[PDB]
């Protein structure tokens, strides 16, 4: 029925805020106790603070109600564990973002959704402009 | 054929010491140098000094060519990725040790051949015993 | 005619439940009071919230009487000193967890009727997968 | 009529490749000898080995002709003082990669052409998917 | 006729109570709130509590008519953008601290009249007191 | 007979390097093993590796044949015991830098020949500056 | 008058807790919050979490007013320096552990009051009890 | 007829110098050659090399007819273990180091009849300072 993205730094926070003011029921996850107060002052969404990898921890989330699972943390082991996690908890729809280019295609096959490669993203971004 | 272990602590390190021995080809995988400078005194075996979870780490390993991918380091989250990135290599033979108990299923359910919980090794073990 | 069991952790908790389901009798000790609350909710036995390492706590379990006495908490030194402490009340049959697998044999020497170490265990168990 | 690109990195290599094949004239540049040799064997083009930030580099990339300067090296300040030297030699057209959101518009006060982070561009890629 | 200083801390103190007895008129930024509230009860002098990279704080510190820019901060990057700013308001005389030494003459190219590295000054002092 | 430096920093370093050239004989000492490394391949003197405050460090340093100890690490207590111990060696001018400048005067009576903050000279170098 | 004790761990916190238990007045410093919260829900005293070598910690202390300055912080260093800052501001009764056993002497001729070594101090406990 | 010491570190090398030198007839033990080597080179006394916690060394030792054993070792459970062995074999004077007070008591109900807290004993040390 909602949201929840894991890993509230440059690209969770953004993203937190933007889709908490587009109208969207989110719950953010951080193994950070500085970084969830941080957010939980700054954006109206429930904070966890915990490991996105351990099941307590998503099911604190509500993992269970999610039809979305974002894990834009900084270790793509976290976002990768996270999401298979999540995934086997019925969740239709999960992100992971890597840290390798090159792992792109592995971890759609493995299962995941969407694999979002911020560097090839912005390589790509670069190009169009380029093209323009 | 050859045999990758990942994480030379006490688990990998005893796996490793027992099959040399017994004629196995095994390379060692870990990311502390020093007990990477300790097993190379000690093992008959190639030792590499890198992170287990990375494209390069495991292709200077063999893993385009291994039977076997054990997966052992302190950090369910490091065994099961770089596990299903042996598997993304052809790796049917993928063993992957857990920190949490829950997870014995759920890995296996997630893609990996094996999943090993010493804790719970260990407990069957000592019923055993008791049941004699 | 029951045992006792200190340190209901990953492989205390597992061990306990397991042999009470099957008809044992047995006493459980931890020093955390949430884990003796998890196992007081979910394990039928006597639950004791004390230090395994003071004479009182292993008078208020019976020591007495034990037929057996278990310790798997997560300290080394505390599962020896806890099960020299049995030993020196009678209990005949001792079963303590290590860490450092070297000390294995001193733990054996001293009267520790069965080390277990669910490293080194883990290490054989997946050993004997390989030899199939 | 030439383009000159910092950082091969993550970002750089990729958009150098793609452009390279696309067939565009292209200077590469890196202070990393091992990353200058395998840009030089994968992608036809100008390489040079240094520090973008040394005007000796630049003008060895001929940074007086350029019709582009691209900064996407990891250091946030590097790509911004390297951009500013191309402006000061006549490059109307500079492309830089920042680390802290917040600097954004300060580099495009500065006259940094196209500022791009890869981190808010995740960010709002994110956030259209699921605006579709 | 007055001076903007950014940067309050070991240097910017110092440099403030100095040059405001020495009766200089004397304009003060920082982003620390406590750090303000002690300058300015401890210094004569106007003091704003603001991003020294944003434009707003600049205004309201009257970069418009200041005669000297001075940006001190423990961020080489924030030294260096708040005095490209200051430039681009006409303000003809810049100090910028920086933190390393190698980008010095960068800094200078870039138009900052006085670069100060405390670290080089102090280098080159101790080996002057070794040439008395 | 020589000098002895501790800390082979941007202070350090840079004296070092400054000093070596000028037909000095001096002996460098760093706790990081790779930063000995670099400056051993850079600088005709000679480099232990190893932590300042020991005894059998500074022994090694050559103590005992020095006329000056200039200890110029990023850690003010290090600096002030390192310094105190060699002036008890007999050494006559010690040099030590602080990172508070309220200490300058304390470790002045304590002892210390010289207490050099980078920060405060970083300050009225400014100062002079403006007064020309 | 006051004692101001420097380093909670196993000789500070047991020294806390003997010398409050007959009515001294005691202040606590350690820069770990966690001992520091520990440590206030226990013993009747004044804790402050800070770093000793710090001028706002001592003073927040008391060091003004202090009768004794008991520095035993697992780092020699820290020990030293701070209980020489403690001498600065007029107490003669500073207390400073050492971890090396050579510095007994030193210390005490570097101006502190009293050297203590715990491991010099057990010997000759051994000793005497030998002796008897 | 003699004294058996392992563990010749800060403790162990100072107290056996200072017995022997008093006329005591000791041996020695450690794991370390350097550090045997050193006791060696200042110390009159049979030095044997190896882990006191392995039988064998304690034959070596002489463990067979020694008055007394003390364990020094840096290693808490080691300390104890050795000196239960040590016990095993008739000696009935035991001293043992610990670095944990809490378990001072368990040391002492198990046999071992003297247990010395190098940390407890300094603190009381102090504290009789204090009292004058
Ligand atoms: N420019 C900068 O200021 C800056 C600052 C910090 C880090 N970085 C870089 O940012 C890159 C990625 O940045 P990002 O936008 O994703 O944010 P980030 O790397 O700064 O942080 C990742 C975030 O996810 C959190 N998290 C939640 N659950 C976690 C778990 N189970 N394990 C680990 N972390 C968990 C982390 O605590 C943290 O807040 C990194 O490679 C790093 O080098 C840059
Ligand atoms: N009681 C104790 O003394 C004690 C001591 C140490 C650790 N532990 C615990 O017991 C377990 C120790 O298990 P173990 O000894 O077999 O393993 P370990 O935890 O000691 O080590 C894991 C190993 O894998 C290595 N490694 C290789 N590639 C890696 C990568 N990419 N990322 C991370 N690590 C990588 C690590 O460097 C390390 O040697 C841990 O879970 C720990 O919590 C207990
Ligand atoms: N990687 C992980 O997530 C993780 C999570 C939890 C625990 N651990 C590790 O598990 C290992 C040991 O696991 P375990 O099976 O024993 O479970 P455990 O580590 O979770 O807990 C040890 C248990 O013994 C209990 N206990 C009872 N009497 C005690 C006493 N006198 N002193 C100390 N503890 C006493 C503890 O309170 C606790 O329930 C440790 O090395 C620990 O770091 C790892
Ligand atoms: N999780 C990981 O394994 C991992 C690994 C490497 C890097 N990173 C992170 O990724 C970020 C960006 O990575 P990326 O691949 O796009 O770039 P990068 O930070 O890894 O590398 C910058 C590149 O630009 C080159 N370069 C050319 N001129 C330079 C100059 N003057 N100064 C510095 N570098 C110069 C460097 O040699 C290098 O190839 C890093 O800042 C780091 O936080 C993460
Ligand atoms: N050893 C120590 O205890 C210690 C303690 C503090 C700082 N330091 C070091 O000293 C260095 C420099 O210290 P310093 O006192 O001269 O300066 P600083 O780095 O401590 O502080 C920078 C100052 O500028 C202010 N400021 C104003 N506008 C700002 C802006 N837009 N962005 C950031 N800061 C802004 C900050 O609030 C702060 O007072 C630091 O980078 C740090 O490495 C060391
Ligand atoms: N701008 C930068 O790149 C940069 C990089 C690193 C650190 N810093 C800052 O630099 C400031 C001081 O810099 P610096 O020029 O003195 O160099 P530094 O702080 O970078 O390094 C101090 C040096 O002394 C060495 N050393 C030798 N003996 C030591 C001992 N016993 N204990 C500790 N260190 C010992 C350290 O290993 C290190 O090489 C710090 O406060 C830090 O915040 C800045
Ligand atoms: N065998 C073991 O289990 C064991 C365990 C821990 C530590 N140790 C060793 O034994 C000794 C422990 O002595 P202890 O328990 O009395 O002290 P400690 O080493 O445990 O702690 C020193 C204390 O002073 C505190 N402190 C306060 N201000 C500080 C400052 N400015 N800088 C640094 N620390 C500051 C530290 O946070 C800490 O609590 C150490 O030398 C260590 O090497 C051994
Ligand atoms: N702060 C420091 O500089 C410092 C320096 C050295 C040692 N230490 C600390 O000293 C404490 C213990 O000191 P200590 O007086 O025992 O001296 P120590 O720590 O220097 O050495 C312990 C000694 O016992 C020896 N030994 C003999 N048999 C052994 C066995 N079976 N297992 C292990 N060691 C054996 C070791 O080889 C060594 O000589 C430790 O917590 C250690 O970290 C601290």
Known sequence: ?????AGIGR??????????????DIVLIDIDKDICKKASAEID????????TKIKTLED?????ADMYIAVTGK?????????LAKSYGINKTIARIS????????????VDVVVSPELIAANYIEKLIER
Chains 1, 2, 3, 4, 5, 6, 7, 8 share one sequence.
């Open 11 to 24: 690209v969770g926070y953004t993203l937190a805020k933007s889709l908490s003011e587009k109208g969207h």
């Open 45 to 52: 969404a429930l904070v966890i603070n915990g490991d996105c």
């Open 76 to 84: 793509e082991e976290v976002n990768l564990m996270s999401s298979l």
């Open 61 to 65: 989330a509500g993992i269970e109600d």
């Open 100 to 111: 390798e280019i090159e792992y792109k295609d592995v971890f759609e096959r493995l299962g």
């Open 1 to 5: 029925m909602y949201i929840i993205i």
